[PDB]
Amino acid sequence: KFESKAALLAARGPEELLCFTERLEDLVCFWEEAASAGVGPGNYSFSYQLEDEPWKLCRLHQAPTARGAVRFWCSLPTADTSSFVPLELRVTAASGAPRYHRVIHINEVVLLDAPVGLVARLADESGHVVLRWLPPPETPMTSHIRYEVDVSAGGSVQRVEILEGRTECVLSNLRGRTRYTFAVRARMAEPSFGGFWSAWSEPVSLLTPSDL
Amino acid sequence: KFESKAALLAARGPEELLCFTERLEDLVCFWEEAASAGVGPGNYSFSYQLEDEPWKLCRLHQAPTARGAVRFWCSLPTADTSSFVPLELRVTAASGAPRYHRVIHINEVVLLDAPVGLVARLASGHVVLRWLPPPETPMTSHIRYEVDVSAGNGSVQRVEILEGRTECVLSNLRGRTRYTFAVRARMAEPSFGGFWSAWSEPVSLLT
Amino acid sequence: TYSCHFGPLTWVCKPQ
Amino acid sequence: TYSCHFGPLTWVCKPQ
């Protein structure tokens, strides 16, 4: 709820034709603008050329936004989501005037689903905190995904980077007799892939041993 | 050459078909046996089969092992060095009697060369190792390493260097002591597999 | 030299 | 699918 209201008060800049792929066989592009009665998805044409093949259309949808703005989005059909060719995108106001131009590569705009099954335990010997987790559901090329872990003290900024492929993390500099909340996020790795960090996964809290 | 006389003595182990690839576009297979007078390449049949492909015969060879046994080796032609698909190998005597049967995957029997140009400098009271990967090898960034640290004067410690990293930064090392380092490499998963290479020429440094 | 495609862990290349 | 192959550092894949 807090984060909800936190978003409402935020500050956005200029509108952008934003695009992303969740699994490497889809693509959703969108943008947002203010309302205007008589302005529905039919007013815009989202066309897209793709590696010398003919331009094609994408049916635009309209959805409401918590901040009172409307967003228009198109999701490309599976067959047109090749991961390494220059997809050109074009959007025009029925009045002829162009709204956006953007040439992207699907592999360059990855935004995965957050990781799952984050579980936490203490190492049998040391007693340190050992973190394990599984990669985002139904997503390919797992060994190419790097992560980042956030460690909060029930403190200060502590975020551990995790070499791509590895879904385990053992922490050792933690105070004893303390509750720590962890949460991990994912990202496609270079150089083949590029994109954005995912949302955080459901968190887990855990006490540390009395003395270490 | 003491290492040389040592290998002559060291106890045996069961006969076995062994295969390995060096530069990931080559494959050698072989076995050793009692050098009984008479035998030769002609007395044995060595053929392989890549899936969805025909059985082919391999031109066997024979050479004396340093220890006295005979090594019969076949070396697949370049074009048949396809990695990810299952390779089958049947070595049977001319009499039909079966000898060996091993199904492998080329990418899973890599015995790289040992690293080169290893160097150990000084820092923050710390020691920094740096080295090159086995010369003329592709997929460089798929090779993980391991460093051997053995303190001179009447010992040891070992570090697992992660993939594609050709530099190690050693910390905890007792003051005035003479250390002798070394490094060895092997192909790393998910794609590859294999065995540890030999060591690289070592380097000593007095702290 | 290989016809690779996205796999669960990483690339999946059967030969060409 | 793509036409990948080996190389110095890692996989090289041109659009097949």
Instruction: Examine residue B6 and state whether it is found in any structural domain, yes or no.
Output: no
Cα distance between residue A187 and residue A20, in whole Å: 13
Tell me, what DSSP letter sits at residue D9? Answer: S
Instruction: Examine residue B72 and state whether it is found in any structural domain, yes or no.
Output: yes
In degrees and rounded to multiples of 5, residue B187 shows phi and psi of -60, 140
User: In chain B, how many domains are there?
Assistant: 2
Tokens in use for A121? 């335990």
CATH code for position B161:
2.60.40.10
Q: Are residues B99 and B126 in the same domain?
A: no
Q: Are residues B25 and B75 in the same domain?
A: yes
Q: Which residues pair with B180 in a beta bridge?
A: B150, B204
Cα distance between residue D3 and residue D13, in whole Å: 5
Give the amino acid at D5: H
Cα distance between residue B17 and residue B47, in whole Å: 13
Interface of B with C in 37-96 (CB under 8 A): 82-85
Instruction: Examine residue A24 and state whether it is found in any structural domain, yes or no.
Output: yes
**Could you tell me how far CA B139 lies from the centroid of its own chain?**
16
Give the amino acid at C10: T
* 3-class SS of residue B140: helix
Four-residue CA torsion sign, A31, A75, D11, A198: positive
Of A109, A136, A158, the one marking the end of a domain is A109
C-alpha separations of C12 from A109, B58, B82 in Å: 22, 28, 13
Asked if residue A187 lies in contact with residue A195, where contact means CB atoms within 8 angstroms, the answer is yes
Of B109, B130, B149, the one marking the end of a domain is B109
B139: left (phi over 0), alpha (psi -120 to 50) or beta: left
Cα distance between residue B184 and residue A164, in whole Å: 23
* H helices present in chain B, as ranges: 2-9
Does the beta-carbon distance from D10 to B141 stay under 8 Å? yes
Q: Are residues B133 and B187 in the same domain?
A: yes
Count CB-CB contacts under 10 A for residue A194.
Answer: 14
Cα B116-B118-B123 angle, rounded to 5 deg: 160
Beta strands in chain A (DSSP E): 18-20, 28-33, 44-50, 53-58, 61-64, 70-75, 87-93, 98-104, 116-122, 129-134, 145-153, 159-162, 168-171, 179-188, 204-207
User: Residue A89, exposed/middle/buried by CB under 10 A (0-12, 13-18, 19+)?
Assistant: buried
Q: What is the DSSP pairing of strand A53-58 with strand A116-122?
A: unpaired
Tell me, what DSSP letter sits at residue B21? Answer: B
| Helices first, then strands: H and E counts in chain D | 0, 2
Does A172 reach chain C within 8 Å, measured CB to CB? no
Cα distance between residue B127 and residue B169, in whole Å: 6
Q: Are residues A53 and A79 in the same domain?
A: yes
Cα distance between residue A78 and residue A105, in whole Å: 15
Q: Are residues B100 and B180 in the same domain?
A: no
Contacts of D13 in chain C (CB under 8 A): 4
* 3-class SS of residue B16: coil
Does B190 reach chain A within 8 Å, measured CB to CB? yes
Instruction: Examine residue B158 and state whether it is found in any structural domain, yes or no.
Output: yes
Cα distance between residue A161 and residue B80, in whole Å: 41
| 3-class SS shares of chain B: helix, strand, coil, % to 5 | 10, 45, 50
Instruction: Examine residue B137 and state whether it is found in any structural domain, yes or no.
Output: yes
Does A163 reach chain B within 8 Å, measured CB to CB? yes
Gaps in chain B (C to N over 2.5 angstroms) fall after 123, 154
Q: Which domain holds residue A95?
A: 13-109
Q: Which residues pair with B145 in a beta bridge?
A: B161, B185
Instruction: Examine residue B3 and state whether it is found in any structural domain, yes or no.
Output: no
Give every strand in the sheet of A145-153, ordered side by side.
Answer: A159-162, A145-153, A179-188, A204-207
C-alpha separations of A163 from A193, B23, B46, B71, D14 in Å: 15, 26, 44, 43, 26
Instruction: Examine residue B179 and state whether it is found in any structural domain, yes or no.
Output: yes
Task: Find tokens 């490499």 and name the residue.
Answer: B185
Q: Which residues pair with B20 in a beta bridge?
A: B28
**Could you tell me how far CA A173 lies from the centroid of its own chain?**
30
Q: Are residues B134 and B94 in the same domain?
A: no
Q: What is the DSSP pairing of strand A129-134 with strand A87-93?
A: unpaired
Q: Are residues B156 and B102 in the same domain?
A: no
Cis before residue B115, ω within 30 degrees of 0?
no
Contacts of C13 in chain A (CB under 8 A): none
Cα distance between residue B26 and residue B192, in whole Å: 15
Of A78, A93, A109, the one marking the end of a domain is A109
Q: Are residues A46 and A35 in the same domain?
A: yes
The contacts of residue A89 (CB under 8 Å, 6+ apart) are A17, A19, A29, A46, A47, A48, A100, A101, A102, A103, A104
C-alpha separations of A174 from A126, A178, B126, B201 in Å: 12, 8, 25, 41
Give the amino acid at D1: T
C-alpha separations of B35 from B16, B39, B101, D10 in Å: 15, 8, 22, 43
| Nearest residue to A22 (alpha-carbon basis) of A138, A150, A130, A162 | A138
Cα distance between residue B126 and residue D9, in whole Å: 29
Q: Residue-wise over B98-131: b if at least 16 C-beta within 10 A, else e?
A: ebeebebebbbbbbbbbbeebebeeeeeebebeb
Q: Which residues pair with A57 in a beta bridge?
A: A47
Q: Are residues B99 and B114 in the same domain?
A: no
Contacts of C11 in chain B (CB under 8 A): 191
Count of residues making up chain D: 16
Cα distance between residue B176 and residue C11, in whole Å: 49
The experimental method, as deposited, was X-ray
Q: Which residues of D touch C (CB under 8 A)?
A: 1-6, 11, 13, 16
Tokens in use for A99? 């709204």
Q: Are residues B83 and B20 in the same domain?
A: yes
Q: Are residues B99 and B119 in the same domain?
A: no
| Nearest residue to B160 (alpha-carbon basis) of B146, B143, B181, B142 | B146
**Resolution of the experimental structure, in angstroms:** 2.7
Cα B142-B18-B43 angle, rounded to 5 deg: 145
Does the beta-carbon distance from C9 to A141 stay under 8 Å? yes
Instruction: Examine residue B7 and state whether it is found in any structural domain, yes or no.
Output: no
The contacts of residue A60 (CB under 8 Å, 6+ apart) are A41, A42, A44, A46, A72, A73, A74
Q: Are residues A129 and A190 in the same domain?
A: yes
